[PDB]
Amino acid sequence: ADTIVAVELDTYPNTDIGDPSYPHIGIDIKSVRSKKTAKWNMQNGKVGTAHIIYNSVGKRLSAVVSYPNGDSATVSYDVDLDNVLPEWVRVGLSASTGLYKETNTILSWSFTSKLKSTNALHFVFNQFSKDQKDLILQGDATTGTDGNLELTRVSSNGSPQGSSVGRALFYAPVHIWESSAVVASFDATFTFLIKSSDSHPADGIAFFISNIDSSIPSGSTGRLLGLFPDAN
Amino acid sequence: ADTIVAVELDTYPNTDIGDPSYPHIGIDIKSVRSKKTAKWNMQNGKVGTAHIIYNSVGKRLSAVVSYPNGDSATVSYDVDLDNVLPEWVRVGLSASTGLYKETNTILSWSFTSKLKSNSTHETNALHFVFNQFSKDQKDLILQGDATTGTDGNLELTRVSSNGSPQGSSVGRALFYAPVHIWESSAVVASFDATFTFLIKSSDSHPADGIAFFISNIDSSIPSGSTGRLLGLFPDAN
Amino acid sequence: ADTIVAVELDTYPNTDIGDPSYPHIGIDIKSVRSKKTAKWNMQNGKVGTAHIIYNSVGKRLSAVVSYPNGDSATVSYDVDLDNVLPEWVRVGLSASTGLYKETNTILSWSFTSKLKSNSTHETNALHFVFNQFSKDQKDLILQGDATTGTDGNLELTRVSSNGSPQGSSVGRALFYAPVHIWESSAVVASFDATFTFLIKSSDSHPADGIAFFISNIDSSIPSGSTGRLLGLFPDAN
Amino acid sequence: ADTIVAVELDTYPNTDIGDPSYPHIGIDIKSVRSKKTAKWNMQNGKVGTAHIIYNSVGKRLSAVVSYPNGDSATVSYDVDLDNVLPEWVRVGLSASTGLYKETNTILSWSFTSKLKSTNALHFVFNQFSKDQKDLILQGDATTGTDGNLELTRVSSNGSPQGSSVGRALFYAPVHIWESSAVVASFDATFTFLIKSSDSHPADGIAFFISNIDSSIPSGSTGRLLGLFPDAN
Numbered sequence: 041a042d043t044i045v046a047v048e049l050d051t052y053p054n055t056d057i058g059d060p061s062y063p064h065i066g067i068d069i070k071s072v073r074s075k076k077t078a079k080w081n082m083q084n085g086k087v088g089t090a091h092i093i094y095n096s097v098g099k100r101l102s103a104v105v106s107y108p109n110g111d112s113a114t115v116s117y118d119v120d121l122d123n124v125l126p127e128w129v130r131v132g133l134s135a136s137t138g139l140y141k142e143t144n145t146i147l148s149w150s151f152t153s154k155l156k157s158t159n160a161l162h163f164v165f166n167q168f169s170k171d172q173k174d175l176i177l178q179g180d181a182t183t184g185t186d187g188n189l190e191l192t193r194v195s196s197n198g199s200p201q202g203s204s205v206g207r208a209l210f211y212a213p214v215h216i217w218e219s220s221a222v223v224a225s226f227d228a229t230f231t232f233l234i235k236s237s238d239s240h241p242a243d244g245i246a247f248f249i250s251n252i253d254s255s256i257p258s259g260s261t262g263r264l265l266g267l268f269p270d271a272n
Numbered sequence: 273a274d275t276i277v278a279v280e281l282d283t284y285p286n287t288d289i290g291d292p293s294y295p296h297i298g299i300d301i302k303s304v305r306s307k308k309t310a311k312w313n314m315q316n317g318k319v320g321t322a323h324i325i326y327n328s329v330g331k332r333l334s335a336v337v338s339y340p341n342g343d344s345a346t347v348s349y350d351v352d353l354d355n356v357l358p359e360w361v362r363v364g365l366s367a368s369t370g371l372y373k374e375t376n377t378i379l380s381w382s383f384t385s386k387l388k389s390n391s392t393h394e395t396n397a398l399h400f401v402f403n404q405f406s407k408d409q410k411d412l413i414l415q416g417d418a419t420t421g422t423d424g425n426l427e428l429t430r431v432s433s434n435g436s437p438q439g440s441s442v443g444r445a446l447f448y449a450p451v452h453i454w455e456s457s458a459v460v461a462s463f464d465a466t467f468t469f470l471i472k473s474s475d476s477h478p479a480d481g482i483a484f485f486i487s488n489i490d491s492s493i494p495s496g497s498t499g500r501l502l503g504l505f506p507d508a509n
Numbered sequence: 510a511d512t513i514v515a516v517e518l519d520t521y522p523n524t525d526i527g528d529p530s531y532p533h534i535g536i537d538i539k540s541v542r543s544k545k546t547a548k549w550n551m552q553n554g555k556v557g558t559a560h561i562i563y564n565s566v567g568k569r570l571s572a573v574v575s576y577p578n579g580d581s582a583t584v585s586y587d588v589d590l591d592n593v594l595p596e597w598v599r600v601g602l603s604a605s606t607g608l609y610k611e612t613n614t615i616l617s618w619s620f621t622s623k624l625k626s627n628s629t630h631e632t633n634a635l636h637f638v639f640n641q642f643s644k645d646q647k648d649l650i651l652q653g654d655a656t657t658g659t660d661g662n663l664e665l666t667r668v669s670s671n672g673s674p675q676g677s678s679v680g681r682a683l684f685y686a687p688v689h690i691w692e693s694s695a696v697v698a699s700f701d702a703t704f705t706f707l708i709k710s711s712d713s714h715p716a717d718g719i720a721f722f723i724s725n726i727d728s729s730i731p732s733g734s735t736g737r738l739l740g741l742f743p744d745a746n
Numbered sequence: 747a748d749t750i751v752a753v754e755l756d757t758y759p760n761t762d763i764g765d766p767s768y769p770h771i772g773i774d775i776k777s778v779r780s781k782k783t784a785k786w787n788m789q790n791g792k793v794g795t796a797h798i799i800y801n802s803v804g805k806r807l808s809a810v811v812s813y814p815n816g817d818s819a820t821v822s823y824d825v826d827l828d829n830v831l832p833e834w835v836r837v838g839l840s841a842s843t844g845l846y847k848e849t850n851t852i853l854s855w856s857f858t859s860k861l862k863s864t865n866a867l868h869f870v871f872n873q874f875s876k877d878q879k880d881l882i883l884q885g886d887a888t889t890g891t892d893g894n895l896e897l898t899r900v901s902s903n904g905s906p907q908g909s910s911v912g913r914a915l916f917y918a919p920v921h922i923w924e925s926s927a928v929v930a931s932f933d934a935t936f937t938f939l940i941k942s943s944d945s946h947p948a949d950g951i952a953f954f955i956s957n958i959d960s961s962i963p964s965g966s967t968g969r970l971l972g973l974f975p976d977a978n
């Protein structure tokens with residue numbers, strides 16, 4: 041299967057597959073069952089920002105999600121990603137809906153990777169284009185004329201569809217670690233707008249790092265967030 | 273045919289096709305016959321650096337090539353690249369040899385492109401830096417004779433196991449991702465590129481040179497573009 | 510007297526001292542009488558963005574000012590700033606009012622300077638960004654009437670507690686550290702600057718404008734430089 | 747007194763004031779007695795590189811020192827620097843000699859600080875100037891025409907002086923934390939050349955963060971590294 045490291049913004053508690061009983065942010069290391077989670081108050085219709093940070097020295101993957109009123113949730117997990125990820129990867133954003141739904145709109149996304157022994161890759165999207173040639177769109181993900189990336193399906197009356205899954209990966213492979221590097225670090229930021237009129241929103245948005253040839257696993261809508269073939 | 277904007281470091285004067293009679297740097301807009309050149313002293317076996325700069329406000333494409341002893345050459349050309357380039361491009365490095373030959377070794381390469389707009393840090397950007405190349409450089413598209421090695425360099429043209437450059441060689445490296453080089457709503461579109469290189473020859477004369485280029489995304493080496501055509505153009509027109 | 514290079518966003522036409530008869534952006538080299546101007550439509554109460562670009566290879570100082578509806582003005586001037594500026598400078602923002610007045614509110618300001626040389630990433634650089642200013646902005650030198658506030662903005666000229674701008678006001682903000690704007694061994698010296706601004710007036714006419722400037726490190730507001738002199742120059746010469 | 751957070755490259759073991767018995771890198775939080783150390787093989791006459799990394803999310807101050815042959819030492823310490831440092835600071839490099847000596851030559855220094863809620867400061871010195879107007883030199887520190895920063899005294903026959911102490915601080919104050927920031931991060935890199943013909947080199951080099959008005963404490967040569975008035 042694919043190899044997956046992901047930071048999940050989990051809006052729907054599936055407390056039978058390891059979720060806590062409450063919306064959360066979690067650090068996923070090769071399993072949808074987060075190694076680490078923190079309670080997250082999602083603010084319906086508000087623009088949130090997620091920051092993800094890691095370096096090979098501290099060996100701590102950290103993430104924080106916040107809203108303009110200052111409320112925020114943070115989670116960190118100690119892990120040496122040299123022993124998890126392949127040397128070359130692709131980086132992306134993933135989202136899904138299931139029986140409940142939400143918009144999974146990305147307003148911006150930036151990523152930086154550095155190997156210092158410097159080699160580096162940095163991209164910033166503050167506005168997306170209709171035909172975004174440096175993005176690989178998988179599943180239901182589209183870019184529009186409003187400058188945003190819709191990861192899951194939306195009807196032309198701006199209503200989110202259910203049972204939807206979509207991804208956006210940066211076109212170029214990324215050299216995420218190299219043995220001779222004294223420092224391998226990466227950081228990513230994205231802003232998002234999750235809006236729902238359901239009685240509960242679902243299922244969430246994730247930033248993920250995968251094998252270069254990663255594709256949406258069969259049957260990964262809903263609680264699997266377009267990342268994992270199963271809940272193991 | 274491809275669309276090509278390029279900065280050439282031209283080591284061999286082909287005066288029959290518009291070259292000045294002396295090694296030179298030039299700005300190539302859709303033709304190997306540079307719109308603008310400057311005399312260039314290539315220092316055999318020394319590591320040189322080339323810097324390339326452009327922005328949509330000044331609409332002046334500039335380049336300077338320098339060596340550690342301080343000598344440098346510069347060329348600038350006024351051009352609105354919105355009227356030349358496709359909206360999406362690939363960026364790359366190209367080099368060739370012909371009847372004369374040289375190593376066309378790249379030791380490092382960086383590139384930045386930015387689109388800035390109406391408010392600020394409504395910004396799209398792409399930046400990459402290679403200060404060491406790896407054997408399997410997955411974010412580079414190698415064409416023709418170009419290879420990357422475990423010595424950390426990019427050899428654009430063929431070299432023998434004994435380090436000797438070969439003639440009638442052509443090769444290029446393109447960054448893997450397409451680049452959004454202009455966009456109509458942006459107020460500023462800028463790019464900049466730097467590479468360092470080691471051109472060394474024992475021939476009666478070095479040839480043919482190295483170029484930084486920007487092309488349509490599906491650009492490939494034109495057939496027969498060794499020698500004076502630098503792997504960029506199908507003819508000397 | 511100070512040495513001043515500036516990009517002016519000039520809201521009030523002082524045709525008696527060389528202004529065109531219409532609001533404009535201009536490039537000021539040691540004089541308030543711009544070497545180059547372009548007609549500029551200031552949009553009262555809208556947030557505008559100014560971008561300023563220069564590098565030592567093209568030796569073209571460029572600037573563009575734009576608003577959210579898409580309208581923009583641009584000006585460029587060919588000049589070798591090595592022959593104008595001291596090796597070390599301070600960079601800043603300046604604004605003034607006179608018989609007419611306007612808010613001269615800065616919402617954000619960024620600046621990058623780079624010296625690149627013989628090999629590569631033998632690079633010296635300075636980069637700062639303010640997207641929010643604080644009450645006690647310790648890395649800014651405020652002169653004249655300039656203040657920073659808890660609304661996150663920099664008010665270059667005086668405003669009343671009821672939000673109303675005042676006349677006969679002048680103020681500036683300089684980044685605290687000196688900047689090494691050129692160095693003889695560098696092959697490339699570049700700088701770039703961006704700021705966003707909100708100019709709003711209820712007067713019969715707004716005046717006088719905002720400038721991005723580069724000065725000697727010990728530059729101070731010239732006496733009597735309110736109004737048409739924009740806090741930059743001691744006279745209209 | 748001053749407030750000091752520092753990463754020390756400690757070439758001389760003062761095992762009576764807390765040093766381990768062997769050259770080390772350590773994380774100093776308001777005391778020369780490092781909260782955390784790691785054994786460090788200093789390579790006489792070789793150019794080393796030090797990287798220092800921190801962010802307010804993971805709350806882990808990390809540092810790594812390496813040489814071109816790949817040998818390296820790393821240390822990390824969990825600390826929330828919002829509770830240690832004043833909001834505004836100056837950042838600098840410090841070095842000293844005592845009864846034993848070494849050159850304390852800085853070949854380059856870069857620093858980046860960001861507040862994301864972005865405000866940012868970044869400077870890079872890959873070559874120093876004779877009159878470096880954006881550096882505050884304290885004590886014996888000088889910049890030369892060879893492009894380097896000599897933190898401690900050197901005779902005109904390139905021999906390092908003893909009982910020497912000097913510092914270089916960046917001219918502008920740095921806004922190192924702000925309450926509303928979702929992410930406050932900083933990173934610093936410097937390259938250095940420590941060379942000695944003594945029978946033991948001493949005393950070391952540190953990257954430090956201080957109150958804006960920090961100055962060399964009286965009697966901080968030797969084992970105090972120009973940072974602390976005493977060994978408490």
Ligand SMILES: O=C(O)CCCc1c[nH]c2ccccc12
Nearest residue numbers: 089148149150166229230863864
């Ligand atoms: O542009 C990026 O993606 C990096 C900066 C993140 C960012 C840019 N603008 C913001 C407004 C609110 C919260 C976060 C941000």
Ligand SMILES: O=C(O)CCCc1c[nH]c2ccccc12
Nearest residue numbers: 157158795854855856872935936
């Ligand atoms: O230039 C800086 O200070 C940041 C990069 C650090 C760095 C630049 N060149 C190197 C060679 C060896 C080891 C580290 C480096």
Ligand SMILES: [Ca+2]
Nearest residue numbers: 050052053054
């Ligand atoms: Ca869930």
Ligand SMILES: [Ca+2]
Nearest residue numbers: 282284285286
């Ligand atoms: Ca030729």
Ligand SMILES: [Ca+2]
Nearest residue numbers: 519521522523
């Ligand atoms: Ca005027």
Ligand SMILES: [Ca+2]
Nearest residue numbers: 756758759760
């Ligand atoms: Ca010691």
Ligand SMILES: [Cl-]
Nearest residue numbers: 269270271272
């Ligand atoms: Cl399952």
Ligand SMILES: [Cl-]
Nearest residue numbers: 506507508509
């Ligand atoms: Cl031909």
Ligand SMILES: [Cl-]
Nearest residue numbers: 743744745746
């Ligand atoms: Cl006058």
Ligand SMILES: [Cl-]
Nearest residue numbers: 975976977978
């Ligand atoms: Cl003591």
Ligand SMILES: [Mn+2]
Nearest residue numbers: 050059066074
């Ligand atoms: Mn979950």
Ligand SMILES: [Mn+2]
Nearest residue numbers: 282291298306
């Ligand atoms: Mn030519």
Ligand SMILES: [Mn+2]
Nearest residue numbers: 519528535543
């Ligand atoms: Mn004017």
Ligand SMILES: [Mn+2]
Nearest residue numbers: 756765772780
């Ligand atoms: Mn110690």
